Nucleic acid binder design. Structure first.
Ligand SMILES: [Zn+2]
Lengths: 51, 102, 120, 59, 86, 135, 134, 50
RNA sequence: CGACUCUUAGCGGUGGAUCACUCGGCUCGUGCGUCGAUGAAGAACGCAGCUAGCUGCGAGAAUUAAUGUGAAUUGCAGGACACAUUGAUCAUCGACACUUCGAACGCACUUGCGGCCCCGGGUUCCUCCCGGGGCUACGCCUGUCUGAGCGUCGCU
RNA sequence: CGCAGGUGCAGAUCUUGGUGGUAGUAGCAAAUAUUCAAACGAGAACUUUGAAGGCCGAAGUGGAGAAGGGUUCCAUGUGA
RNA sequence: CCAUCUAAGGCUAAAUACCGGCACGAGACCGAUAGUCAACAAGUACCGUAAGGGAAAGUUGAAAAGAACUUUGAAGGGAG
RNA sequence: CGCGACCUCAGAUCAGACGUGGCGACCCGCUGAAUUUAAGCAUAUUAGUCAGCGGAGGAAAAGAAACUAACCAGGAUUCCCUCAGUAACGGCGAGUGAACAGGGAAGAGCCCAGCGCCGAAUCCCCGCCGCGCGUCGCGGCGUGGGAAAUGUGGCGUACGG
């Protein structure tokens, strides 16, 4: 094994921004959040906003 | 060796290159060290601009680049004289000087 | 015996104490080869460390006196002049390191570095 | 006696005389396979080896 | 004849202990060491033997002076002063 | 010139390396004069040298040496540089004027083999494969 | 969570330091809790165990309310010996059972000038911390 | 041979003194791993570097 | 009937796989970046109450002093430390000490042979014998002393 | 659910370790030779003492050295 | 004809390098036939005249509480 | 043919200093192959690479144009990206192969010799005194030695002085 193996990957900035938008949109759907096992019950609103 | 269509490639791997391989795993480390050097220098010269002396306007010397203007090494002795700044006091004021520019 | 109690003493009584410790240590080594008691064998370590303690005081006092005698002298023994590193002893002294030519001094006086700022 | 390896018969004779107050006729020297030096110190006819040995404590 | 019979004649010694490196590589007739080159002022060392250097490099012995120098460096090689008395 | 020190003139190998007789030393005869003065006078510092004479078999040079521990030298700021440890045996590292001439350094298009400080420095830089983290 | 870049969280490094610590570091490693009454008297939670300290065992086979005296602090073995914590060999003689000081409670500490000094240091430091929090 | 130098004799003296068995109390030391002297040398079996 | 042979299972053994563990490595990164004639690196020989090796140390030898710490070390024994008329242990380490080789340095590498100047003991200025101490290597720089030359000259 | 490999052995006269059958087999056959009794001892063809019969036969199977070995020398004890 | 510089003397920090050294931190790495040859009295044992070559070898148990005592045997070794 | 001076040399256990050896991953100066590829092989390649030698430092080397360019011009060195697998080299085969411009990291400039002016203004050593004094600098004095006119110091170095 050699140290000059490719360890690092570069992703396009537009694709990285795309992934964040998709992650944010999914975080507002309670079905997807419960499918992560996040125990969102008794939570008043899934897009929880506090002062 | 050749198999159907392709490119005639000439890789330069005939010279024991594995002994001289430059890995860049220290690249993030040298960014922090360069950054901390800038911040320490800025504090040490605190009131001074911390970006070096003022450089003159310079025209790039080729047809490809003579429509652009960049920063030069220093103000020439002719423009310093017209402005009325002594060439031995410009460096103390914060004026870069290039005695070899025409 | 304690080193601090040995410092307020003269060289002759320090030599007398050293002699009695060597005589005692010679006696204990005799007991070691003739099947002596375990209490006598354990005293060999004690007497040996007292001889070291006394010889330390004599040598330290002698070296301190030599350092006082050679203080201010232009030439000192190599044992007394400081031992840092061969390379550091080759390097220039602090005075010669800050020596400046008259040309350099004029430059510093006539065109000193200035404290300045540029407004936005 | 067992003596220091860096000790000749003159030093051995003077030392035995100094710390035991006895007169030495002759000294013979040997280096053992252990590595230590052994000295055979014959005393003067006036002195008795058994009496000296009693005072030293070896018997 | 070569073989067991000839080994019976081996009763001399081409090499003796060396007074500089300590190995039994001091040639008696040539008066030189095949391990360190003793009478030569510089020690015998070669880059084709990396194992040989590792056997006899700095750090394989006591380092009587160098280990105190390492300790003394941590305090600026101070000298001539003592800690404050009680 | 430099005769190749091979027994009986036998350089074993390919014909291109068979030369024994018209080979030349890379350094000048003046450089080897400075080197021989420095090696004998280890406690001194070679400063420079110049030509004095010439024969059919010998060349004569005169070398200037500085005792770096004389007080007249290390109390004068204009000559305290020679006392610094980085200036030991300049003649053996090609740092004197005669030594530098053989290194082939300069400015411009005639001197690109040493565009990084030395021939070895330039060779290493253009013979090292740069493998970045993001390739 | 640890933030100091000079403190190691490595398993091997922490275990190595523990297992060949010098004797004076093994002293503070072999600390035991003070009793509730002693923690009330001196504002100190724990002290390094010391010979002639009265302790009781709170874990293991010899747990109980009995108070015993520390007779040996075997710092090399990382154990202490108490008066009554013992068993019988095959021969019939009695040997002490080593107890780790983290499993005992000090009910009375031997008092001397050095012990009073470090009791006061630990109380002063804690009182400063409580005042800072307030 | 009988004819030997001082340097050789001192070398043979040291090898003689270090050819002893391990003491019995070493086995009782806390954290002991030595069971026997693995550097024992017999004159007939193994010869000296000299 | 056995014996013998084959197969399978149980149990027992020549054996040390697998699994679990790891005060070890390997790799990357950071800060420093310091040897030596004031004798280095490396060798040799020694040093513990009982201790061969590893380790530590150098004739004061598994350590002295000093500072910090504050009651142990420990395999057995012995005796400290009364645990302030100030201190076990450990750490740190700026004081002291540091055998023989080794660039290795009086000559020589055999515990060989000197020389000069001093000190002590036998005899008394034989320095004759013994013991101890300081010097006694090469190259080279500035200065110093003593010199050489049918070298260039001056006064004679 | 994804990510990444030093990811699957019957072979390579493969590497390291372990083990069989052979096999209680080959063998313990160069230089003439041993026997009787006693002692110690748990135990004796082999140790020791005594008595017989033999050998080396002074260019020795004798008495001493040089190289080389390095404690193998000597006494006491053990019989792993 | 034009452009450009001023050789054969000298000093100079920073940005750059770092498989040796002194201290540190970490890891999608190996887990005792692996990982450094070396997790252990490892450049050790041992081999070669020498230059040099160069291993194997980790794990009782929480705690030695490491089997007192009886008995057979000369003991190793067994039975309790 | 005595006594001096200078010059060129010599000896000294003369008074003070300095070099040697080690480590060597990184750095500087030399020297320097063949295995290999070319499906053979000699030029070429491997490669100015391995081995050999010398010399250092915490960095080294380089470095303030006898430069680039041909533009509406840039402006010491060093390093990174790109230029560029390009211009070019090569039994023009196998193969090898930079630089300038441009963007960045850092950024810093200076000194003699020479020509001159100034009564050698200069430097080393040794003493004494006032000092100061972490292991050594200052001022004076010296009816104290030496170096230096076969040239020390101050001004001044191409940007002119
Ligand atoms: Zn040698």
């Amino acid at each position: 094994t050699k140290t000059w193996r490719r360890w690092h990957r570069r992703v396009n900035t537009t694709q990285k921004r795309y992934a964040i938008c998709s992650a944010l949109a999914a975080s507002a759907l309670p079905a997807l959040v419960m499918s992560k096992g996040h125990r969102i019950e008794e939570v008043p609103e899934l897009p929880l906003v506090v002062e | 060796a050749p198999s159907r269509n392709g490119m005639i490639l000439k890789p330069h791997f005939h010279k024991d290159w594995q002994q001289r391989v430059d890995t860049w795993f220290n690249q993030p480390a040298r960014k922090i060290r360069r950054r901390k050097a800038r911040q320490a220098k800025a504090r040490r010269i605190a009131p001074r601009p911390a970006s070096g002396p003022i450089r003159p306007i310079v025209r790039c010397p080729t047809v490809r680049y003579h429509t652009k203007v960049r920063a030069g090494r220093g103000f020439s002795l002719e423009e310093l004289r017209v402005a009325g700044i002594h060439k031995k006091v410009a460096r103390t004021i914060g004026i870069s000087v290039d005695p070899r520019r025409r | 015996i304690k080193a601090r109690d040995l410092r307020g003493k003269k060289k002759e009584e320090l030599l007398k104490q050293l002699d009695d410790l060597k005589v005692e240590l010679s006696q204990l080594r005799v007991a070691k080869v003739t099947g002596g008691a375990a209490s006598k064998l354990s005293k060999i370590r004690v007497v040996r460390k007292s001889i070291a303690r006394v010889l330390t005081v004599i040598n330290q006092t002698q070296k301190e006196n030599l350092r006082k005698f050679y203080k201010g002298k232009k030439y000192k023994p190599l044992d007394l002049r400081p031992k840092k590193t061969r390379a550091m002893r080759r390097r220039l002294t602090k005075h010669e390191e800050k020596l400046k030519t008259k040309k350099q001094q004029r430059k510093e006086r006539l065109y000193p570095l200035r404290k300045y700022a540029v407004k936005a | 006696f067992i003596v220091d390896v860096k000790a000749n018969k003159h030093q051995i004779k003077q030392a035995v005389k100094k710390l035991y107050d006895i007169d030495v006729a002759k000294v013979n020297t040997l280096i053992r396979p252990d590595g230590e030096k052994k000295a055979y110190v014959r005393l003067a006819p006036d002195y008795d080896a058994l009496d000296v040995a009693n005072k030293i404590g070896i018997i | 004849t070569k073989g067991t019979s000839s080994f019976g004649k081996r009763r001399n010694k081409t090499h003796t202990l060396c007074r500089r490196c300590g190995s039994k590589a001091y040639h008696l007739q040539k008066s030189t060491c095949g391990k360190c080159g003793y009478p030569a002022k510089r020690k015998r060392k070669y880059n084709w033997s990396a194992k040989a250097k590792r056997r006899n490099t700095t750090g394989t012995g006591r380092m009587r002076h160098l280990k105190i120098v390492y300790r003394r460096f941590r305090h600026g090689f101070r000298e001539g002063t003592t800690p404050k008395p009680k | 010139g430099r005769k190749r020190p091979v027994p009986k003139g036998a350089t074993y190998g390919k014909p291109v390396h068979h030369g024994v007789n018209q080979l030349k030393f890379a350094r000048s005869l003046q450089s080897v004069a400075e080197e021989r003065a420095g090696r004998h006078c280890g406690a001194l510092r070679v400063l420079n040298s110049y030509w004095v004479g010439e024969d059919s078999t010998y060349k004569f040079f005169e070398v200037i040496l500085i005792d770096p521990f004389h007080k007249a030298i290390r109390r004068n700021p204009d000559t305290q540089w020679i006392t610094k440890p980085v200036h030991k045996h300049r003649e053996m590292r090609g740092l004197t004027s005669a030594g530098r001439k053989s290194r082939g350094l300069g400015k411009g298009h005639k001197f690109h083999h040493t565009i990084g400080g030395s021939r070895r420095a330039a060779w290493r830089r253009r013979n090292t494969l740069q493998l970045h983290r993001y390739r | 969570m640890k933030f100091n870049p000079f403190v190691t969280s490595d398993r091997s490094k922490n275990r190595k330091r523990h297992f060949n610590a010098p004797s004076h570091i093994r002293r503070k490693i072999m600390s035991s809790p003070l009793s509730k009454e002693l923690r009330q008297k001196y504002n100190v939670r724990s002290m390094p165990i010391r010979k002639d300290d009265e302790v009781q065992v709170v874990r293991g086979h010899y747990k109980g309310q009995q108070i015993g005296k520390v007779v040996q602090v075997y710092r090399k073995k990382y154990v202490i010996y108490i008066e009554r914590v013992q068993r019988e060999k095959a021969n019939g003689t009695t040997v002490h059972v080593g107890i780790h000081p983290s499993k005992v409670v000090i009910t009375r500490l031997k008092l001397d000038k050095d012990r009073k000094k470090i009791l006061e240091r630990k109380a002063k430091s804690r009182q400063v911390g409580k005042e800072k929090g307030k | 041979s009988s004819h030997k130098t001082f340097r050789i004799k001192r070398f043979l003296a040291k090898k003689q003194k270090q050819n002893r068995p391990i003491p019995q109390w070493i086995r009782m030391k806390t954290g002991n791993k030595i069971r026997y002297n693995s550097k024992r040398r017999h004159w007939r079996r193994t010869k000296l570097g000299l």
